[PDB]
Amino acid sequence: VVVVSVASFVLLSMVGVAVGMCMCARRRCITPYELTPGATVPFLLSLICCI
Amino acid sequence: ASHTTLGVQDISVTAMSWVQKITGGVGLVVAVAALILIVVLCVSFSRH
Amino acid sequence: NDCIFEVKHEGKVTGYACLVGDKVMKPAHVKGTIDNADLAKLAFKRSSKYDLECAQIPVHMKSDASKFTHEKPEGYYNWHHGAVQYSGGRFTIPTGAGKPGDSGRPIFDNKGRVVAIVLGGANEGARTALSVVTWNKDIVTKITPEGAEEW
């Protein structure tokens, strides 16, 4: 129970980290477009980073 | 009979080959048509 | 001008159809039929993406269609109800310059060419941004300001 509970918790934590890194990367990659006037966001970025 | 009964999955090998070829043939046509529509829609959203 | 036809509703004019190039263009949001029977009987192709209904002009008896261009330099254009300013990617007019029922009116450049068809606009305070149909060298595109309403 200890190994399964701990291993499960750690694996879930690492998934949360992978997602958090994606959210951080997305926010930073998008930011310059949100700040810039006109902001002609390219199609590939729009689909890749959901914008 | 000393043997048991058959299910729907117990058709002959030759029959199964024919079913796979026919099913694959139609499935391929759908998969291709679906891909074409997906590409056209992606282009249609590239022109917004 | 004089390439503008009224779109008749059951009891009113709800917009206009314009002859541009070899096609007669009508906003899809406008309901009713074209006043001229020769165009009313003409089949149209509708597209909700561009808010257009277009059909081939019977040019053999319709040689008065307007000339058009894809060129859109910053500057001023003539749209019948006044002067319209083009800046950045948008066409702008005085807020009281347009109203519902005026859609379908073309925007002309200083050489008399049709540049865009007015669909509607958004009231931005001192000025209103127009929702218009434009074209590039290849295809038709649609420009819609946030909060824009159909006219």
List residues bridging with C108 in a β-sheet.
Answer: C78, C114
Strand partners, C130: C121
Which has the closest alpha carbon to C66: C116, C141, C140, C6? C116
CB of A49 closer than 8 Å to CB of A33: no
Q: How far is CA C96 from CA C49, C89, C90, C99, C131, in A?
A: 28, 21, 18, 7, 15
Q: How far apart are CA C63 and CA C41, in angstroms?
A: 18
Q: Using H for helix, E for strand and C for coil, what is the string for B1-48?
A: CCCCCCCCCCCCHHHHHHHHHHHHHHHHHHHHHHHHHHHHHHHHCCCC
| One-letter amino acid of C104 | G
Would you call B47 an interface residue with chain C, using a CB distance cutoff of 8 Å? yes
- Point out which residues pair with C93 in neighbouring strands: C128
Q: Are C115 and C143 in contact (CB under 8 A)?
A: no
Judge contact between C71 and C49, C-beta under 8 A. no
Please give the single-letter amino acid code of residue A19.
V
Reply yes or no on whether C22 is catalytic. Answer: no
Residue C66 among the catalytic residues:
no
The catalytic residue among C63, C66, C103, C109 is C103
Q: Chain C interface, mutation test: which of B43, B44, B47, most C Cβ atoms within 10 Å? A: B47
Question: By CB neighbour count within 10 A (0-12 exposed, 13-18 middle, 19+ buried), where does C130 fall?
Answer: buried
Query: How many helical (H) and strand (E) elements, i.e. helices and strands, does chain C have?
Result: 1, 14
Method by which the coordinates were obtained: cryo-EM
Q: Which residues contact C19 (CB under 8 A, 6 or more apart)?
A: C3, C4, C5, C25, C57, C62, C64, C65, C66
Q: Name, in order, each residue with C-beta under 8 angstroms of C97's C-beta and a sequence gap of 6 or more.
A: C81, C82, C84, C128
Yes or no, beta carbons of B44 and C141 under 8 Å apart:
no
Give the whole-angstrom CA distance, residue B15 versus residue B7: 14
How near does any CA of chain B get to the CA of C67, in Å?
Answer: 25
Distance CA C85, CA C113 (A): 16
Tell whether C139 lies on the interface with B, counting CB pairs under 8 A: yes
Distance from the Cα of residue C65 to its chain's centroid: 14
Q: Residue B44: closest CA among chain C residues belongs to which residue?
A: C49
Q: Would you list the DSSP string of C48-99? A: TTTTEEEEE--GGG---PBPB-----SEEEE-SSSEEEEETTEEEEETTT--
Q: Report d(CA C71, CA C111) in Å as an integer.
A: 11
CA C19 – CA A16 distance, rounded (Å): 58
For the record, the structure tokens of C78 come out as 């003539």
Q: Which of C125, C134, C127 is nearest to C107 (CA)?
A: C134
| Residues C42 and C58 sit within 8 Å (Cβ to Cβ) | yes
In DSSP terms, A32 is beta-bridged to none
B25: Cβ contacts below 8 Å, ≥ 6 apart? none
Nearest-CA neighbor of C135 among C115, C112, C108? C115
